[PDB]
Amino acid sequence: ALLRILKETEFKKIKVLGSGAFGTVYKGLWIPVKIPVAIKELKANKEILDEAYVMASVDNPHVCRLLGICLTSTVQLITQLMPFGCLLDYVREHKDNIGSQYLLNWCVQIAKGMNYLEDRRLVHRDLAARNVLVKTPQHVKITDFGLAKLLGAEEKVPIKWMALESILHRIYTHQSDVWSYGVTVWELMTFGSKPYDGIPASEISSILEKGERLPQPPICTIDVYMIMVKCWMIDADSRPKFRELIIEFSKMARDPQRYLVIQGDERNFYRALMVVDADE
Numbered sequence: 367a368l369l370r371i372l373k374e375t376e377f378k379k380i381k382v383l384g385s386g387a388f389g390t391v392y393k394g395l396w397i398p399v400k401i402p403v404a405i406k407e408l409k410a411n412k413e414i415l416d417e418a419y420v421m422a423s424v425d426n427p428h429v430c431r432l433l434g435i436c437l438t439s440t441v442q443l444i445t446q447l448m449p450f451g452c453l454l455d456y457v458r459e460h461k462d463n464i465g466s467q468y469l470l471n472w473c474v475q476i477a478k479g480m481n482y483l484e485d486r487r488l489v490h491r492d493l494a495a496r497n498v499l500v501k502t503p504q505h506v507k508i509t510d511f512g513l514a515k516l517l518g519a520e521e522k523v524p525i526k527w528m529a530l531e532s533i534l535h536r537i538y539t540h541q542s543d544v545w546s547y548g549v550t551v552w553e554l555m556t557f558g559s560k561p562y563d564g565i566p567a568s569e570i571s572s573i574l575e576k577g578e579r580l581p582q583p584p585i586c587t588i589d590v591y592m593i594m595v596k597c598w599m600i601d602a603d604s605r606p607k608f609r610e611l612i613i614e615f616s617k618m619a620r621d622p623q624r625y626l627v628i629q630g631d632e633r634n635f636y637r638a639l640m641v642v643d644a645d646e
């Protein structure tokens with residue numbers, strides 16, 4: 367069964383991870399051996415089970431997969447626990463130990479994961495560094511795709527990560543996801559800064575129309591920054607394609623010190639923070 371129907375007893379919400387944008391995520395154990403899992407708690411659930419199947423049918427090393435679902439009073443989404451937490455918090459905590467090699471590789475990995483979703487005709491709708499998880503320092507994965515639509519994202523909100531056409535018309539495409547990719551990259555390059563910090567969400571569409579964009583990160587060469595800016599063009603068709611982003615950042619990954627200037631570039635443990643891996 368691709369989307370395993372789990373019984374209220376097979377798993378248990380041990381601790382709390384964090385209050386998300388669509389629900390609360392817990393850390394826990396699952397017994398179909400005990401497997402560490404992330405549990406997100408948000409008769410007509412036939413609708414959900416549909417968009418839920420998609421989330422479980424993805425198979426790419428850069429995209430999290432939904433492993434199970436529990437349909438009771440509430441819907442609980444069960445996935446494999448990523449021990450290092452989300453990338454946003456990761457870069458914030460290692461702001462002085464993250465080299466250009468890692469930063470570029472993550473951009474490549476996020477780009478591959480996004481290209482994979484585009485091949486499945488799945489618009490994420492909420493890509494951001496907080497929705498990129500760290501399996502290990504050299505392996506990151508995209509998560510939380512599809513939930514946005516499954517709750518009326520484009521029905522009658524992460525404004526600062528959204529493309530202009532999404533804010534004004536609720537239009538979501540793989541190209542609006544490219545814009546958010548641009549913002550996600552900005553978050554990594556600034557080591558976790560909040561985009562448009564100190565600017566009211568209501569004024570965002572206004573500043574974007576006037577041509578204003580997030581500033582060039584200190585460590586970025588104009589070449590890296592040019593890619594981000596292209597991702598934020600009003601004309602969605604003119605923005606880079608994830609496929610082109612994979613190739614461009616891969617190229618830069620071969621000569622990192624040339625595209626990112628990080629002083630001393632070359633040269634808390636999530637054990638006490640956070641049985642067999644779901645992968646096992």
Ligand SMILES: COCCO/N=C/c1c(N)ncnc1Nc1ccc2c(cnn2Cc2cccc(F)c2)c1
Binds near residue numbers: 449
């Ligand atoms: C501020 O710091 C917060 C740190 O929280 N880290 C949390 C977390 C984690 N350390 N490991 C794994 N998942 C984590 N969250 C998380 C994110 C999305 C989720 C679930 C469960 N269901 N869904 C929907 C979904 C949609 C599409 C594909 C999927 F696989 C899952 C859990």
